[PDB]
């Protein structure tokens, strides 16, 4: 069966040997002959949100994505810095506003949401963002929506995770319920995990410092873990 | 958060170094301090369905499960033999009837289904089994149902997989739709994969020759991949 879309889901690169780890992955993905429609990086791109790390990340990943004709989708994590990411990864004016955006890949909507809280490790979504999200989802996409964020809306199975988990998941749940969100892509946990959130499948990719393949069929979304 | 139930999801042990691989896993799980309510093995237990392999499997796994007070849940795979498994793993009279069974873990229903076809590698579910399954699911379990089987009802992302995939998934889908089946546990693929089937989350554990942790919360089921 041919999927409608193929995505690559990578997370938690933590660049500041993370350079070798990511380099080795990209080289391995290049040799596979995989041709993704988009490559989605679900946060913690730079370990300390360093300008130099973003420059290195961009230098490694942009030629890889260009070779494949794949859209690059960057997401904020708790380790990242909004202003330095905008500047050195995106070529956008520095700002501390949430990195929220919408990207249509043919008929497939990818929504990037920013769960990060500046100077903190836990996750939160502000009122402005929920409203923005609700308004966007009021119009259905032809092939539905993939929501990409950092902190997963799933129960913490480790005590260590609870202190840095996504807070106020109920409010997000109220926005997402009944929408065309078909899957939520996340990171943060540094091990491969899946669950549902208000009936929506959530898939967490492990850290790079493997990744996931995402096959979007007409009726289901398949997430495969690539070590 | 405390889950309602903890399950261990292991698959594709292929015993006939698979002995060392499984031994090393069980020892590792024992050191973790994990106390599962059940341990579910989703098929391909013996590589050639050998009596000796089932004896070895039983010898390795029964003391492990006994130490933890965990229920053992065995599932048929394409590599297994129904008669030899019944005899040497279960202490049951030899039979080639499908290995279908129901196990209540407090309020949680685990249904074991047999997708294997004797002498063949692909998956099928017979009419007798669908009827049996439909009748069982007509009564809801207090905490819903986990369906455990070998061949996953998810699209084959590899060409090699298509020839040995589960056939006639539509019929199974018709039975499961609207039931209290909250999750489907599967194997067969030999890599970690998740998707939905008729709105129901399906989680495939990789092979042993790691495994998954399953945390059942009141409102969601979390699957975590343990390398
Ligand atoms: Fe991280
Ligand atoms: Fe197998
Ligand atoms: Mn994080
Ligand atoms: Mn198999």
Curated annotation (Swiss-Prot), chains A, B:
<keyword id="KW-0963">Cytoplasm</keyword>
<dbReference type="GO" id="GO:0005886">
    <property type="term" value="C:plasma membrane"/>
</dbReference>
<keyword id="KW-0597">Phosphoprotein</keyword>
<keyword id="KW-0114">cAMP</keyword>
<keyword id="KW-0547">Nucleotide-binding</keyword>
<dbReference type="GO" id="GO:0000166">
    <property type="term" value="F:nucleotide binding"/>
</dbReference>
<feature type="binding site">
    <location>
        <position position="190"/>
    </location>
    <ligand>
        <name>Fe cation</name>
    </ligand>
</feature>
<protein>
    <recommendedName>
        <fullName>cAMP/cGMP dual specificity phosphodiesterase Rv0805</fullName>
        <ecNumber>3.1.4.16</ecNumber>
        <ecNumber>3.1.4.17</ecNumber>
    </recommendedName>
</protein>
<feature type="binding site">
    <location>
        <position position="12"/>
    </location>
    <ligand>
        <name>Fe cation</name>
    </ligand>
</feature>
<feature type="binding site">
    <location>
        <position position="44"/>
    </location>
    <ligand>
        <name>AMP</name>
    </ligand>
</feature>
<feature type="binding site">
    <location>
        <position position="44"/>
    </location>
    <ligand>
        <name>Mn(2+)</name>
    </ligand>
</feature>
<keyword id="KW-0378">Hydrolase</keyword>
<dbReference type="GO" id="GO:0030313">
    <property type="term" value="C:cell envelope"/>
</dbReference>
<comment type="similarity">
    <text>Belongs to the cyclic nucleotide phosphodiesterase class-III family.</text>
</comment>
<dbReference type="GO" id="GO:0005506">
    <property type="term" value="F:iron ion binding"/>
</dbReference>
<keyword id="KW-0140">cGMP</keyword>
<keyword id="KW-0964">Secreted</keyword>
<feature type="binding site">
    <location>
        <position position="14"/>
    </location>
    <ligand>
        <name>Fe cation</name>
    </ligand>
</feature>
<keyword id="KW-0134">Cell wall</keyword>
<feature type="binding site">
    <location>
        <position position="188"/>
    </location>
    <ligand>
        <name>Mn(2+)</name>
    </ligand>
</feature>
<keyword id="KW-0408">Iron</keyword>
<dbReference type="GO" id="GO:0008199">
    <property type="term" value="F:ferric iron binding"/>
</dbReference>
<keyword id="KW-0472">Membrane</keyword>
<keyword id="KW-0464">Manganese</keyword>
<feature type="binding site">
    <location>
        <position position="150"/>
    </location>
    <ligand>
        <name>Mn(2+)</name>
    </ligand>
</feature>
<feature type="binding site">
    <location>
        <position position="78"/>
    </location>
    <ligand>
        <name>Mn(2+)</name>
    </ligand>
</feature>
<dbReference type="GO" id="GO:0042545">
    <property type="term" value="P:cell wall modification"/>
</dbReference>
<feature type="binding site">
    <location>
        <position position="44"/>
    </location>
    <ligand>
        <name>Fe cation</name>
    </ligand>
</feature>
<feature type="binding site">
    <location>
        <position position="190"/>
    </location>
    <ligand>
        <name>AMP</name>
    </ligand>
</feature>
<dbReference type="GO" id="GO:0004115">
    <property type="term" value="F:3',5'-cyclic-AMP phosphodiesterase activity"/>
</dbReference>
<keyword id="KW-0479">Metal-binding</keyword>
<keyword id="KW-1003">Cell membrane</keyword>
<dbReference type="GO" id="GO:0005576">
    <property type="term" value="C:extracellular region"/>
</dbReference>
<dbReference type="GO" id="GO:0009274">
    <property type="term" value="C:peptidoglycan-based cell wall"/>
</dbReference>
<dbReference type="GO" id="GO:0042301">
    <property type="term" value="F:phosphate ion binding"/>
</dbReference>
<feature type="binding site">
    <location>
        <position position="14"/>
    </location>
    <ligand>
        <name>AMP</name>
    </ligand>
</feature>
<comment type="function">
    <text>Cyclic nucleotide phosphodiesterase with a dual-specificity for the second messengers cAMP and cGMP. Can use 2',3'-cAMP, 2',3'-cGMP, 3',5'-cAMP, 3',5'-cGMP and 3',5'-cUMP. Hydrolysis of 2',3'-cAMP produces a mixture of 3'-AMP (major product) and 2'-AMP (minor product). In vitro, is 150-fold more active in hydrolyzing 2',3'-cAMP than 3',5'-cAMP. Can also hydrolyze the model substrates p-nitrophenyl phosphate (pNPP), bis-(p-nitrophenyl phosphate) (bis(pNPP)) and p-nitrophenyl phenylphosphonate (pNPPP).</text>
</comment>
<dbReference type="GO" id="GO:0047555">
    <property type="term" value="F:3',5'-cyclic-GMP phosphodiesterase activity"/>
</dbReference>
<dbReference type="GO" id="GO:0005737">
    <property type="term" value="C:cytoplasm"/>
</dbReference>
<feature type="binding site">
    <location>
        <begin position="78"/>
        <end position="79"/>
    </location>
    <ligand>
        <name>AMP</name>
    </ligand>
</feature>
<dbReference type="GO" id="GO:0008663">
    <property type="term" value="F:2',3'-cyclic-nucleotide 2'-phosphodiesterase activity"/>
</dbReference>
<dbReference type="GO" id="GO:0030145">
    <property type="term" value="F:manganese ion binding"/>
</dbReference>
């Amino acid at each position: 069966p041919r999927p409608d879309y193929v995505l690559l889901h990578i997370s938690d690169t933590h660049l500041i040997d993370a350079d070798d780890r990511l380099g080795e992955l990209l080289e391995q993905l290049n040799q596979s002959g995989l041709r993704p429609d988009a490559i989605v990086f679900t946060g913690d791109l730079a370990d300390k949100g360093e300008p130099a790390a973003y420059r290195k990340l961009r230098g490694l990943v942009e030629p890889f994505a260009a070779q494949l004709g794949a859209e690059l989708v960057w997401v904020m994590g708790n380790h990242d810095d909004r202003a330095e990411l905008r500047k050195f990864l995106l070529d956008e004016a520095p700002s501390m506003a949430p990195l929220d955006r919408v990207c249509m890949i043919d008929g497939l909507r990818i929504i990037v949401l920013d769960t990060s809280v500046p100077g903190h490790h836990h996750g939160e979504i502000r009122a402005s963002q929920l409203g923005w999200l609700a308004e966007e989802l009021a119009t259905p996409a032809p092939d539905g929506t993939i929501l990409a964020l950092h902190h997963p809306p799933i129960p913490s199975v480790l005590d260590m995770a609870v202190t840095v988990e996504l807070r106020d998941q109920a409010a997000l749940g109220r926005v997402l319920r009944g929408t065309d969100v078909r899957a939520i892509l996340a990171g943060h946990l540094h091990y491969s995990t899946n669950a549902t959130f208000v009936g929506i499948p959530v898939s967490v990719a492990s850290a790079t410092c493997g990744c996931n393949l995402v096959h979007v069929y007409p009726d289901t979304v398949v997430h495969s873990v690539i070590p």
